[PDB]
């Protein structure tokens, strides 16, 4: 089985945390909870369903970080008038992905902000 404080799903172990942290701190914190630990990653709707329910049954309604960061930083941002991108006035520098314990839909939040989270590792 997985460590007593974690839950098992198809060979992997998951564990939700109630202490809020920004994305980076959450990811780093996960690497310290167990060898191979990382923020939870959803490779299927079934895995997402398991984690969403686990998160809700543990801490109820809230938002939890998933392991996807800087989602639009690498995009090819272009001006419609063909002007080259030089000057920048972004309100936020990067967005990260999270889910609300009500359903498995993906949502975005500035990485610098806080949120609960779920860690995962392969047993």
């Amino acid at each position: 089985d997985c460590p007593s404080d974690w839950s098992s799903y198809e060979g992997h172990c998951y564990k939700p945390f109630s202490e809020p942290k920004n994305w980076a701190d959450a990811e780093n914190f996960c690497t310290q909870q167990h060898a191979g630990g990382h923020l939870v990653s959803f490779q299927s709707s079934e895995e997402a369903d398991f984690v969403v329910k686990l998160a809700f049954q543990t801490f109820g309604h809230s938002i939890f970080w998933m392991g996807l960061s800087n989602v639009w930083n690498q995009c090819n941002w272009q001006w419609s008038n063909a002007a080259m991108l030089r000057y920048k006035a972004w309100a936020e520098e990067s967005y990260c992905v999270y889910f609300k314990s009500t359903n498995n839909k993906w949502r975005s939040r500035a990485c610098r902000m806080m949120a609960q989270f779920v860690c995962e590792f392969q047993a």
Binding site: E27, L39, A89, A91, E92, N104, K105, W106
Partner: protein
């Protein structure tokens, strides 16, 4: 000089529109408002301050964002091909409105900062030629 209804700045002409359109429709609309027209491009702090004031004074009571011409070319939901565990992203379940690959100005930040927003919203905008 600029056409009646348009404002001038650094040799270019700008015009605010309190019409609710998706980014695609707004851009197309702008190309048809003037030869060489497009959604506004903000290429310097000076242009940013001018546009912020133009919007503050001409797009009132809309309670919405205001489109600018900068956006992600492709319509991918995200451009980061990798989870923190190293695996690729071959499964996604985004709420469309949560994939914010367009940008708009907002009253809360004085219409001076670019906010990531869903390209599918219907917002007023500014055209430039």
């Amino acid at each position: 000089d600029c056409p009646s209804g348009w404002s001038s700045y650094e040799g270019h002409c700008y015009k605010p529109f309190k019409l609710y359109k998706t980014w695609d429709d707004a851009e197309r609309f702008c190309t048809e408002q003037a030869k060489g027209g497009h959604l506004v491009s903000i290429e310097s702090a000076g242009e940013a301050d001018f546009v912020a004031q133009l919007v503050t004074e001409n797009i009132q009571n809309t309670k919405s964002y205001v489109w600018i011409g900068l956006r992600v070319q492709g319509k991918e939901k995200q451009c980061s091909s990798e989870w923190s565990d190293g695996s690729s992203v071959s499964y996604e379940n985004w709420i469309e409105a949560e994939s914010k690959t367009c940008l708009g100005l907002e009253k809360e930040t004085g219409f001076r900062k670019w906010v990531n927003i869903y390209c599918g919203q219907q917002n007023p905008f500014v055209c430039e030629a």
